[PDB]
Design an enzyme around this catalytic site. Structure first.
Site, PDB file in Angstrom:
ATOM      1  N   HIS A 112       0.799  -1.220   0.000  1.00 49.73           N
ATOM      2  CA  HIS A 112       0.000   0.000   0.000  1.00 49.73           C
ATOM      3  C   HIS A 112       0.833   1.272   0.000  1.00 49.73           C
ATOM      4  CE1 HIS A 112      -3.264  -2.832   1.416  1.00 49.73           C
ATOM      5  NE2 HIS A 112      -3.777  -2.241   0.354  1.00 49.73           N
TER       6      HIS A 112
ATOM      7  N   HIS B  48       1.369   1.251  -5.827  1.00 48.87           N
ATOM      8  CA  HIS B  48      -0.005   0.761  -5.884  1.00 48.87           C
ATOM      9  C   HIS B  48      -0.961   1.886  -6.293  1.00 48.87           C
ATOM     10  CE1 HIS B  48      -3.811  -1.092  -4.822  1.00 48.87           C
ATOM     11  NE2 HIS B  48      -4.036  -0.177  -3.893  1.00 48.87           N
TER      12      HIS B  48
ATOM     13  N   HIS C 117      -6.617   7.223  -2.935  1.00 44.93           N
ATOM     14  CA  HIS C 117      -7.427   6.198  -2.278  1.00 44.93           C
ATOM     15  C   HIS C 117      -6.805   5.409  -1.136  1.00 44.93           C
ATOM     16  CE1 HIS C 117      -5.648   2.808  -4.446  1.00 44.93           C
ATOM     17  NE2 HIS C 117      -6.341   2.041  -3.628  1.00 44.93           N
ATOM     18  N   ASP C 118      -5.471   5.326  -1.097  1.00 46.00           N
ATOM     19  CA  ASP C 118      -4.741   4.635  -0.021  1.00 46.00           C
ATOM     20  C   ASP C 118      -3.669   5.520   0.641  1.00 46.00           C
ATOM     21  OD1 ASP C 118      -5.887   2.083   0.259  1.00 46.00           O
ATOM     22  OD2 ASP C 118      -4.752   1.181  -1.340  1.00 46.00           O
TER      23      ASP C 118
ATOM     24  N   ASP D 277      -8.649  -1.392  -8.099  1.00 47.86           N
ATOM     25  CA  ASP D 277      -8.014  -1.750  -6.835  1.00 47.86           C
ATOM     26  C   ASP D 277      -7.755  -3.261  -6.762  1.00 47.86           C
ATOM     27  OD1 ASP D 277      -6.982  -0.825  -4.333  1.00 47.86           O
ATOM     28  OD2 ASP D 277      -8.851  -1.089  -3.303  1.00 47.86           O
TER      29      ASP D 277
ATOM     30  N   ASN E 231      -4.816  -6.643  -9.727  1.00 45.49           N
ATOM     31  CA  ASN E 231      -3.513  -7.326  -9.791  1.00 45.49           C
ATOM     32  C   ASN E 231      -3.567  -8.679 -10.499  1.00 45.49           C
ATOM     33  OD1 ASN E 231      -2.408  -6.329  -6.434  1.00 45.49           O
ATOM     34  ND2 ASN E 231      -2.562  -5.101  -8.307  1.00 45.49           N
TER      35      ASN E 231
ATOM     36  N   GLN F 299      -3.958 -17.230  -3.273  1.00 42.86           N
ATOM     37  CA  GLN F 299      -4.216 -16.436  -4.479  1.00 42.86           C
ATOM     38  C   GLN F 299      -5.342 -17.061  -5.302  1.00 42.86           C
ATOM     39  OE1 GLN F 299      -3.420 -13.382  -5.601  1.00 42.86           O
ATOM     40  NE2 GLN F 299      -2.464 -13.217  -3.562  1.00 42.86           N
TER      41      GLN F 299
ATOM     42  N   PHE G 100      -8.460 -16.170  -3.582  1.00 45.17           N
ATOM     43  CA  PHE G 100      -8.719 -14.739  -3.777  1.00 45.17           C
ATOM     44  C   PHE G 100      -9.405 -14.544  -5.130  1.00 45.17           C
ATOM     45  CE2 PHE G 100      -6.575 -10.468  -4.901  1.00 45.17           C
ATOM     46  CZ  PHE G 100      -7.527  -9.721  -4.240  1.00 45.17           C
TER      47      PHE G 100
HETATM   48  C1  LIG Z   1      -2.136  -9.789  -5.009  1.00 48.71           C
HETATM   49  O1  LIG Z   1      -2.922 -10.201  -3.890  1.00 48.71           O
HETATM   50  C2  LIG Z   1      -3.754  -9.336  -3.219  1.00 48.71           C
HETATM   51  C3  LIG Z   1      -3.861  -7.975  -3.511  1.00 48.71           C
HETATM   52  C4  LIG Z   1      -4.738  -7.163  -2.775  1.00 48.71           C
HETATM   53  C5  LIG Z   1      -5.517  -7.701  -1.746  1.00 48.71           C
HETATM   54  C6  LIG Z   1      -6.489  -6.903  -0.891  1.00 48.71           C
HETATM   55  C7  LIG Z   1      -7.814  -7.549  -0.930  1.00 48.71           C
HETATM   56  N1  LIG Z   1      -8.860  -8.050  -0.938  1.00 48.71           N
HETATM   57  C8  LIG Z   1      -5.983  -6.920   0.556  1.00 48.71           C
HETATM   58  C9  LIG Z   1      -6.922  -6.185   1.513  1.00 48.71           C
HETATM   59  C10 LIG Z   1      -7.157  -4.738   1.086  1.00 48.71           C
HETATM   60  C11 LIG Z   1      -8.174  -4.097   2.002  1.00 48.71           C
HETATM   61  O2  LIG Z   1      -8.996  -4.806   2.628  1.00 48.71           O
HETATM   62  O3  LIG Z   1      -8.158  -2.857   2.118  1.00 48.71           O
HETATM   63  C12 LIG Z   1      -7.618  -4.680  -0.374  1.00 48.71           C
HETATM   64  C13 LIG Z   1      -6.676  -5.445  -1.321  1.00 48.71           C
HETATM   65  C14 LIG Z   1      -5.389  -9.061  -1.476  1.00 48.71           C
HETATM   66  C15 LIG Z   1      -4.518  -9.871  -2.204  1.00 48.71           C
HETATM   67  O4  LIG Z   1      -4.394 -11.210  -1.933  1.00 48.71           O
HETATM   68  C16 LIG Z   1      -5.014 -11.845  -0.810  1.00 48.71           C
HETATM   69  C17 LIG Z   1      -4.462 -11.329   0.517  1.00 48.71           C
HETATM   70  C18 LIG Z   1      -3.377 -12.294   0.970  1.00 48.71           C
HETATM   71  C19 LIG Z   1      -3.356 -13.422  -0.050  1.00 48.71           C
HETATM   72  C20 LIG Z   1      -4.647 -13.320  -0.852  1.00 48.71           C
HETATM   73 MG   LIG Z   2      -7.592   0.757   0.585  1.00 38.96          MG
HETATM   74 ZN   LIG Z   3      -5.847   0.132  -2.768  1.00 42.46          ZN
END
Ligand SMILES: COc1ccc([C@]2(C#N)CC[C@@H](C(=O)O)CC2)cc1OC1CCCC1
Ligand SMILES: [Mg+2]
Ligand SMILES: [Zn+2]
Length: 326
Positions: A75, A79, A115-116, A233, A236, A284, A287
Protein backbone atom coordinates in the site's frame (compact mmCIF):
# COMPACT_ATOMS: atom_id res chain seq x y z
CA UNK A 1 19.74 11.54 -20.04
CA UNK A 2 19.22 7.92 -21.18
CA UNK A 3 17.16 7.25 -18.02
CA UNK A 4 14.77 10.08 -18.96
CA UNK A 5 14.40 8.77 -22.54
CA UNK A 6 13.60 5.23 -21.37
CA UNK A 7 11.04 6.61 -18.89
CA UNK A 8 9.28 8.47 -21.73
CA UNK A 9 9.14 5.26 -23.82
CA UNK A 10 7.61 3.27 -20.94
CA UNK A 11 5.00 6.01 -20.43
CA UNK A 12 3.93 5.69 -24.08
CA UNK A 13 2.01 2.57 -22.89
CA UNK A 14 -0.09 4.54 -20.37
CA UNK A 15 -3.27 3.61 -22.28
CA UNK A 16 -2.49 -0.13 -22.06
CA UNK A 17 -3.35 -2.79 -19.48
CA UNK A 18 -0.01 -4.12 -18.24
CA UNK A 19 2.00 -0.90 -18.05
CA UNK A 20 5.47 -1.61 -16.61
CA UNK A 21 4.66 0.29 -13.40
CA UNK A 22 7.61 -1.05 -11.37
CA UNK A 23 10.09 -0.05 -14.08
CA UNK A 24 8.51 3.42 -14.17
CA UNK A 25 8.86 3.67 -10.38
CA UNK A 26 12.58 2.90 -10.71
CA UNK A 27 13.22 5.24 -13.67
CA UNK A 28 11.38 8.19 -12.07
CA UNK A 29 13.33 8.07 -8.78
CA UNK A 30 10.35 6.53 -6.98
CA UNK A 31 7.87 9.03 -8.42
CA UNK A 32 5.48 6.72 -10.32
CA UNK A 33 2.34 8.44 -9.01
CA UNK A 34 3.54 11.91 -10.03
CA UNK A 35 4.74 11.00 -13.54
CA UNK A 36 1.78 8.70 -14.31
CA UNK A 37 -0.79 11.25 -13.05
CA UNK A 38 0.92 14.05 -15.02
CA UNK A 39 0.96 11.89 -18.15
CA UNK A 40 -2.73 10.99 -17.77
CA UNK A 41 -3.75 14.61 -17.09
CA UNK A 42 -1.95 15.68 -20.29
CA UNK A 43 -3.45 12.79 -22.32
CA UNK A 44 -7.01 13.67 -21.25
CA UNK A 45 -6.38 17.43 -21.57
CA UNK A 46 -7.47 17.95 -17.94
CA UNK A 47 -5.03 20.82 -17.26
CA UNK A 48 -6.59 22.94 -20.01
CA UNK A 49 -10.17 21.84 -19.30
CA UNK A 50 -10.01 22.76 -15.60
CA UNK A 51 -7.33 25.48 -15.91
CA UNK A 52 -4.92 23.69 -13.60
CA UNK A 53 -1.50 25.41 -13.56
CA UNK A 54 1.10 22.72 -14.31
CA UNK A 55 3.30 23.82 -11.38
CA UNK A 56 0.29 23.46 -9.06
CA UNK A 57 -0.44 19.94 -10.33
CA UNK A 58 3.16 18.80 -9.88
CA UNK A 59 3.43 20.35 -6.41
CA UNK A 60 0.24 18.62 -5.23
CA UNK A 61 1.23 15.30 -6.81
CA UNK A 62 4.68 15.26 -5.20
CA UNK A 63 3.13 16.19 -1.84
CA UNK A 64 0.50 13.44 -2.14
CA UNK A 65 3.13 10.91 -3.20
CA UNK A 66 5.25 11.91 -0.17
CA UNK A 67 2.35 10.88 2.09
CA UNK A 68 2.43 7.29 0.82
CA UNK A 69 4.86 5.34 3.02
CA UNK A 70 8.08 4.14 1.36
CA UNK A 71 8.45 1.33 3.93
CA UNK A 72 5.05 -0.33 3.29
CA UNK A 73 5.47 -3.13 0.74
CA UNK A 74 2.09 -3.03 -0.99
CA UNK A 75 0.00 0.00 0.00
CA UNK A 76 2.46 2.57 -1.29
CA UNK A 77 2.84 5.06 -4.16
CA UNK A 78 3.39 2.29 -6.74
CA UNK A 79 -0.01 0.76 -5.88
CA UNK A 80 -1.62 4.21 -6.07
CA UNK A 81 -0.01 4.82 -9.48
CA UNK A 82 -1.20 1.38 -10.64
CA UNK A 83 -4.80 2.00 -9.54
CA UNK A 84 -4.78 5.44 -11.22
CA UNK A 85 -3.53 3.99 -14.50
CA UNK A 86 -5.94 1.04 -14.33
CA UNK A 87 -8.86 3.44 -13.76
CA UNK A 88 -7.60 5.51 -16.70
CA UNK A 89 -7.72 2.43 -18.98
CA UNK A 90 -11.17 1.38 -17.68
CA UNK A 91 -12.54 4.89 -18.39
CA UNK A 92 -11.58 4.37 -22.07
CA UNK A 93 -13.68 1.19 -22.45
CA UNK A 94 -15.79 1.42 -25.65
CA UNK A 95 -18.97 0.63 -23.65
CA UNK A 96 -18.31 3.78 -21.57
CA UNK A 97 -17.56 5.99 -24.59
CA UNK A 98 -18.60 9.56 -23.76
CA UNK A 99 -20.69 8.32 -20.81
CA UNK A 100 -18.87 10.32 -18.13
CA UNK A 101 -18.20 14.07 -18.07
CA UNK A 102 -14.72 15.55 -17.68
CA UNK A 103 -15.60 16.36 -14.04
CA UNK A 104 -16.56 12.72 -13.36
CA UNK A 105 -13.37 11.55 -15.08
CA UNK A 106 -11.37 13.99 -12.94
CA UNK A 107 -13.13 12.66 -9.82
CA UNK A 108 -12.41 8.99 -10.62
CA UNK A 109 -8.75 9.64 -11.37
CA UNK A 110 -8.27 11.87 -8.31
CA UNK A 111 -10.05 9.33 -6.08
CA UNK A 112 -7.74 6.61 -7.41
CA UNK A 113 -4.66 8.71 -6.69
CA UNK A 114 -5.57 9.42 -3.05
CA UNK A 115 -7.43 6.20 -2.28
CA UNK A 116 -4.74 4.63 -0.02
CA UNK A 117 -2.69 7.70 1.02
CA UNK A 118 -0.93 7.45 4.42
CA UNK A 119 -1.74 3.72 4.65
CA UNK A 120 0.15 2.25 7.68
CA UNK A 121 0.42 -1.27 6.24
CA UNK A 122 -2.15 -2.79 8.64
CA UNK A 123 -5.85 -3.56 8.18
CA UNK A 124 -8.97 -1.86 9.52
CA UNK A 125 -9.57 -4.86 11.76
CA UNK A 126 -6.05 -4.63 13.21
CA UNK A 127 -6.65 -0.94 13.91
CA UNK A 128 -9.95 -1.76 15.64
CA UNK A 129 -8.44 -4.67 17.64
CA UNK A 130 -5.50 -2.60 18.92
CA UNK A 131 -7.74 0.29 20.03
CA UNK A 132 -5.88 2.62 17.68
CA UNK A 133 -6.35 6.37 17.50
CA UNK A 134 -7.63 5.97 13.92
CA UNK A 135 -10.37 3.51 14.95
CA UNK A 136 -11.31 5.80 17.85
CA UNK A 137 -11.56 8.80 15.52
CA UNK A 138 -13.69 6.99 12.95
CA UNK A 139 -15.88 4.84 15.21
CA UNK A 140 -14.70 1.55 13.71
CA UNK A 141 -16.29 2.14 10.28
CA UNK A 142 -14.26 2.51 7.08
CA UNK A 143 -11.41 3.58 9.34
CA UNK A 144 -8.60 3.76 6.81
CA UNK A 145 -10.81 4.85 3.90
CA UNK A 146 -12.06 7.88 5.81
CA UNK A 147 -8.44 8.70 6.69
CA UNK A 148 -7.20 8.40 3.08
CA UNK A 149 -9.88 10.88 2.02
CA UNK A 150 -9.15 13.30 4.85
CA UNK A 151 -5.44 13.36 4.00
CA UNK A 152 -5.98 13.64 0.23
CA UNK A 153 -8.27 16.64 0.61
CA UNK A 154 -6.23 18.29 3.38
CA UNK A 155 -3.11 18.33 1.17
CA UNK A 156 -4.92 20.56 -1.36
CA UNK A 157 -4.59 23.34 1.23
CA UNK A 158 -0.76 23.27 1.23
CA UNK A 159 1.16 26.01 -0.64
CA UNK A 160 0.48 25.95 -4.39
CA UNK A 161 -1.41 22.63 -4.08
CA UNK A 162 -5.05 23.53 -4.86
CA UNK A 163 -5.44 21.89 -8.27
CA UNK A 164 -9.19 22.66 -8.16
CA UNK A 165 -8.73 26.43 -7.64
CA UNK A 166 -10.32 27.32 -11.01
CA UNK A 167 -13.35 25.03 -10.70
CA UNK A 168 -16.67 26.69 -9.88
CA UNK A 169 -18.07 26.21 -6.36
CA UNK A 170 -20.63 23.83 -7.88
CA UNK A 171 -17.94 21.76 -9.56
CA UNK A 172 -15.86 21.59 -6.36
CA UNK A 173 -18.86 20.42 -4.33
CA UNK A 174 -19.78 17.78 -6.90
CA UNK A 175 -16.21 16.50 -7.26
CA UNK A 176 -15.79 16.27 -3.47
CA UNK A 177 -18.99 14.27 -3.07
CA UNK A 178 -18.06 11.88 -5.89
CA UNK A 179 -14.52 11.36 -4.60
CA UNK A 180 -15.82 10.54 -1.10
CA UNK A 181 -18.42 8.14 -2.53
CA UNK A 182 -15.74 6.36 -4.59
CA UNK A 183 -13.04 6.03 -1.92
CA UNK A 184 -15.48 4.86 0.76
CA UNK A 185 -16.52 2.11 -1.71
CA UNK A 186 -12.94 0.72 -1.68
CA UNK A 187 -13.59 -0.62 1.85
CA UNK A 188 -13.71 -4.43 1.43
CA UNK A 189 -16.51 -4.77 4.00
CA UNK A 190 -18.72 -3.17 1.28
CA UNK A 191 -17.59 -5.50 -1.54
CA UNK A 192 -20.43 -8.06 -1.36
CA UNK A 193 -23.18 -5.42 -1.35
CA UNK A 194 -21.41 -3.44 -4.10
CA UNK A 195 -21.18 -6.58 -6.25
CA UNK A 196 -24.81 -7.52 -5.56
CA UNK A 197 -25.94 -4.07 -6.70
CA UNK A 198 -23.68 -4.25 -9.79
CA UNK A 199 -25.26 -7.57 -10.77
CA UNK A 200 -28.70 -5.95 -10.44
CA UNK A 201 -27.65 -3.13 -12.79
CA UNK A 202 -26.37 -5.63 -15.37
CA UNK A 203 -29.73 -7.49 -15.36
CA UNK A 204 -31.65 -4.38 -16.48
CA UNK A 205 -28.87 -2.39 -18.16
CA UNK A 206 -29.83 -0.09 -21.04
CA UNK A 207 -27.51 0.39 -24.01
CA UNK A 208 -27.42 2.07 -27.41
CA UNK A 209 -27.26 0.00 -30.62
CA UNK A 210 -23.43 0.12 -30.35
CA UNK A 211 -23.42 -1.22 -26.77
CA UNK A 212 -22.68 2.07 -24.97
CA UNK A 213 -24.17 2.23 -21.46
CA UNK A 214 -26.97 4.66 -20.69
CA UNK A 215 -26.71 6.03 -17.15
CA UNK A 216 -28.92 8.98 -16.29
CA UNK A 217 -29.13 9.57 -12.53
CA UNK A 218 -26.41 10.09 -9.96
CA UNK A 219 -27.09 6.77 -8.22
CA UNK A 220 -26.37 4.72 -11.35
CA UNK A 221 -23.43 6.86 -12.50
CA UNK A 222 -21.65 6.83 -9.14
CA UNK A 223 -22.34 3.09 -8.80
CA UNK A 224 -20.44 2.41 -12.03
CA UNK A 225 -17.55 4.69 -10.96
CA UNK A 226 -17.43 3.02 -7.53
CA UNK A 227 -17.24 -0.44 -9.09
CA UNK A 228 -14.73 0.78 -11.69
CA UNK A 229 -12.23 2.01 -9.08
CA UNK A 230 -12.95 -1.07 -6.94
CA UNK A 231 -12.06 -3.22 -9.99
CA UNK A 232 -8.88 -1.19 -10.51
CA UNK A 233 -8.01 -1.75 -6.84
CA UNK A 234 -8.59 -5.50 -7.34
CA UNK A 235 -6.85 -5.69 -10.74
CA UNK A 236 -3.51 -7.33 -9.79
CA UNK A 237 -4.57 -10.88 -10.80
CA UNK A 238 -5.77 -9.62 -14.23
CA UNK A 239 -2.35 -8.17 -15.14
CA UNK A 240 0.46 -9.97 -16.96
CA UNK A 241 1.82 -12.68 -14.64
CA UNK A 242 5.21 -10.95 -14.26
CA UNK A 243 3.44 -7.96 -12.64
CA UNK A 244 0.89 -10.03 -10.69
CA UNK A 245 3.61 -12.14 -9.03
CA UNK A 246 5.32 -8.95 -7.81
CA UNK A 247 2.04 -7.69 -6.33
CA UNK A 248 1.58 -11.06 -4.60
CA UNK A 249 5.08 -10.88 -3.09
CA UNK A 250 4.32 -7.38 -1.82
CA UNK A 251 0.92 -8.06 -0.25
CA UNK A 252 2.34 -11.15 1.47
CA UNK A 253 5.27 -9.11 2.84
CA UNK A 254 2.78 -6.59 4.26
CA UNK A 255 0.47 -9.28 5.68
CA UNK A 256 3.39 -11.12 7.30
CA UNK A 257 4.60 -7.87 8.91
CA UNK A 258 1.11 -7.34 10.36
CA UNK A 259 1.20 -10.92 11.63
CA UNK A 260 4.56 -10.18 13.26
CA UNK A 261 3.03 -7.15 15.05
CA UNK A 262 0.10 -9.34 16.17
CA UNK A 263 2.50 -12.02 17.45
CA UNK A 264 4.52 -9.38 19.35
CA UNK A 265 1.29 -8.20 21.05
CA UNK A 266 0.01 -11.70 21.89
CA UNK A 267 -2.97 -11.41 19.54
CA UNK A 268 -4.48 -14.09 17.33
CA UNK A 269 -2.74 -13.90 13.95
CA UNK A 270 -5.10 -12.81 11.15
CA UNK A 271 -5.79 -15.12 8.19
CA UNK A 272 -2.84 -15.31 5.74
CA UNK A 273 -0.62 -13.19 8.07
CA UNK A 274 1.37 -16.07 9.64
CA UNK A 275 4.70 -16.43 7.81
CA UNK A 276 5.25 -19.81 9.53
CA UNK A 277 1.87 -21.24 8.35
CA UNK A 278 1.30 -19.71 4.91
CA UNK A 279 -0.06 -21.16 1.65
CA UNK A 280 0.59 -18.25 -0.73
CA UNK A 281 -0.50 -19.99 -3.94
CA UNK A 282 -3.65 -21.57 -2.50
CA UNK A 283 -4.53 -18.15 -1.07
CA UNK A 284 -4.22 -16.44 -4.48
CA UNK A 285 -6.41 -19.05 -6.15
CA UNK A 286 -8.97 -18.53 -3.38
CA UNK A 287 -8.72 -14.74 -3.78
CA UNK A 288 -9.47 -15.13 -7.48
CA UNK A 289 -12.29 -17.66 -7.04
CA UNK A 290 -14.19 -15.89 -4.26
CA UNK A 291 -13.48 -12.18 -4.88
CA UNK A 292 -11.66 -11.17 -8.05
CA UNK A 293 -13.28 -13.40 -10.66
CA UNK A 294 -16.87 -12.84 -9.41
CA UNK A 295 -16.26 -9.09 -9.57
CA UNK A 296 -14.52 -9.01 -12.97
CA UNK A 297 -17.00 -11.42 -14.57
CA UNK A 298 -19.78 -9.04 -13.54
CA UNK A 299 -17.88 -5.98 -14.81
CA UNK A 300 -17.25 -7.92 -18.05
CA UNK A 301 -20.99 -8.51 -18.43
CA UNK A 302 -21.64 -4.77 -17.92
CA UNK A 303 -19.22 -3.71 -20.69
CA UNK A 304 -19.49 -6.88 -22.84
CA UNK A 305 -17.32 -7.74 -24.67
CA UNK A 306 -14.69 -5.06 -23.90
CA UNK A 307 -13.22 -6.75 -20.81
CA UNK A 308 -12.70 -10.16 -22.45
CA UNK A 309 -8.90 -9.78 -22.67
CA UNK A 310 -8.72 -8.82 -18.97
CA UNK A 311 -10.85 -11.85 -18.03
CA UNK A 312 -8.69 -14.09 -20.25
CA UNK A 313 -5.55 -12.97 -18.42
CA UNK A 314 -7.22 -13.54 -15.04
CA UNK A 315 -8.13 -17.09 -16.01
CA UNK A 316 -4.60 -17.75 -17.38
CA UNK A 317 -3.08 -16.57 -14.11
CA UNK A 318 -5.46 -18.63 -11.98
CA UNK A 319 -4.50 -21.70 -14.01
CA UNK A 320 -0.81 -20.98 -13.52
CA UNK A 321 -1.06 -20.40 -9.76
CA UNK A 322 -3.12 -23.60 -9.43
CA UNK A 323 -0.41 -25.53 -11.34
CA UNK A 324 2.15 -24.53 -8.68
CA UNK A 325 0.09 -26.39 -6.05
CA UNK A 326 1.15 -30.07 -5.96
C1 LIG B 1 -2.14 -9.79 -5.01
O1 LIG B 1 -2.92 -10.20 -3.89
C2 LIG B 1 -3.75 -9.34 -3.22
C3 LIG B 1 -3.86 -7.98 -3.51
C4 LIG B 1 -4.74 -7.16 -2.78
C5 LIG B 1 -5.52 -7.70 -1.75
C6 LIG B 1 -6.49 -6.90 -0.89
C7 LIG B 1 -7.81 -7.55 -0.93
N1 LIG B 1 -8.86 -8.05 -0.94
C8 LIG B 1 -5.98 -6.92 0.56
C9 LIG B 1 -6.92 -6.19 1.51
C10 LIG B 1 -7.16 -4.74 1.09
C11 LIG B 1 -8.17 -4.10 2.00
O2 LIG B 1 -9.00 -4.81 2.63
O3 LIG B 1 -8.16 -2.86 2.12
C12 LIG B 1 -7.62 -4.68 -0.37
C13 LIG B 1 -6.68 -5.44 -1.32
C14 LIG B 1 -5.39 -9.06 -1.48
C15 LIG B 1 -4.52 -9.87 -2.20
O4 LIG B 1 -4.39 -11.21 -1.93
C16 LIG B 1 -5.01 -11.84 -0.81
C17 LIG B 1 -4.46 -11.33 0.52
C18 LIG B 1 -3.38 -12.29 0.97
C19 LIG B 1 -3.36 -13.42 -0.05
C20 LIG B 1 -4.65 -13.32 -0.85
MG1 LIG C 1 -7.59 0.76 0.58
ZN1 LIG D 1 -5.85 0.13 -2.77
Amino acid sequence: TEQEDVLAKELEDVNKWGLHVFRIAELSGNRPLTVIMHTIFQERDLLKTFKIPVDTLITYLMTLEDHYHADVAYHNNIHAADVVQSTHVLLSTPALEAVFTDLEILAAIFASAIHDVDHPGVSNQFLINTNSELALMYNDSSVLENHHLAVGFKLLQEENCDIFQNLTKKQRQSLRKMVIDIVLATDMSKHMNLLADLKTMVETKKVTSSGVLLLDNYSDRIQVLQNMVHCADLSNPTKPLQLYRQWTDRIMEEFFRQGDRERERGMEISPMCDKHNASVEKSQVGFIDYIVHPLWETWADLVHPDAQDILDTLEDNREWYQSTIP
